[PDB]
């Protein structure tokens, strides 16, 4: 697909049987999802952004489907204002920036 | 050009006779640069991200050359962790996400 940037690049992603709306964010190293209960072990982590840092839960090897494309990787869960798909997952689906 | 995301998408920008490094960020509505002086009248604005909100100074109609392409628009200045080129200017240089 080719996605223009006139509006926020929100797409549908599938995780654990739940379909959510997420922002394709080239400005995020990691993928951060709104509070959700994922099974498996996790580790505490601090991630920073424009207004400071927030504490999140890091889960590994989580299957995620982004617009029909299948990916598997790390997912951080915490109090983020919006669901965010980062570069760790975007690279897996061959996503690039073009101009 | 085509930029992959295995590494942060940093590019050189030229603004006011100054060269700086910025990140092409599809997750930001606006363009925010670290503290610096710019010509013209500026007004206080507040923006938010993960971690909360910060105060910035808004400068309108500022010429910005991004990796060779010209844009003229709004540039915010403040305590951002990294210089970021947001969608307001990405659209001007015809940038899109592809996969």
């Amino acid at each position: 697909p080719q996605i223009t940037l006139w509006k926020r690049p929100l797409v549908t992603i599938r995780i654990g049987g739940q379909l959510k709306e997420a922002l394709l964010n080239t400005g995020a190293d990691d993928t951060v999802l709104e509070e959700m209960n994922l099974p498996g072990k996790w580790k505490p982590k601090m991630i920073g952004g424009i207004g400071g840092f927030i504490k999140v839960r890091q889960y590994d090897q989580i299957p995620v489907e982004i617009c029909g494309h299948k990916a598997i990787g790390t997912v951080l869960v915490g109090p983020t204002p919006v669901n965010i798909i980062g570069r760790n997952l975007l690279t897996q689906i061959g996503c690039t920036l073009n101009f | 050009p085509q930029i992959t995301l295995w590494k942060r998408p940093l590019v050189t920008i030229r603004i006011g006779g100054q060269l700086k490094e910025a990140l092409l960020n599809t997750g930001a509505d606006d363009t925010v640069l670290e503290e610096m002086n710019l010509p013209g009248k500026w007004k206080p604005k507040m923006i938010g991200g993960i971690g909360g909100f910060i105060k910035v100074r808004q400068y309108d109609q500022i010429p910005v050359e991004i990796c060779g392409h010209k844009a003229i628009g709004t540039v915010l200045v403040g305590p951002t962790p990294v210089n970021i080129i947001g969608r307001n200017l990405l659209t001007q240089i015809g940038c899109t996400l592809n996969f």
């Binding site: 922002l23 964010n25 400005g27 995020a28 190293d29 990691d30 951060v32 601090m46 991630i47 920073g48 952004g49 424009i50 840092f53 983020t80 204002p81 919006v82 965010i84 980062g86 | 990140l23 960020n25 997750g27 930001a28 509505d29 606006d30 925010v32 604005k45 507040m46 923006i47 938010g48 991200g49 993960i50 951002t80 962790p81 990294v82 970021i84 947001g86």
Partner: peptide
């Protein structure tokens, strides 16, 4: 430390 730079006015 990783950065997640989502931003909105």
């Amino acid at each position: 430390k990783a950065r997640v730079l989502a931003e909105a006015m």
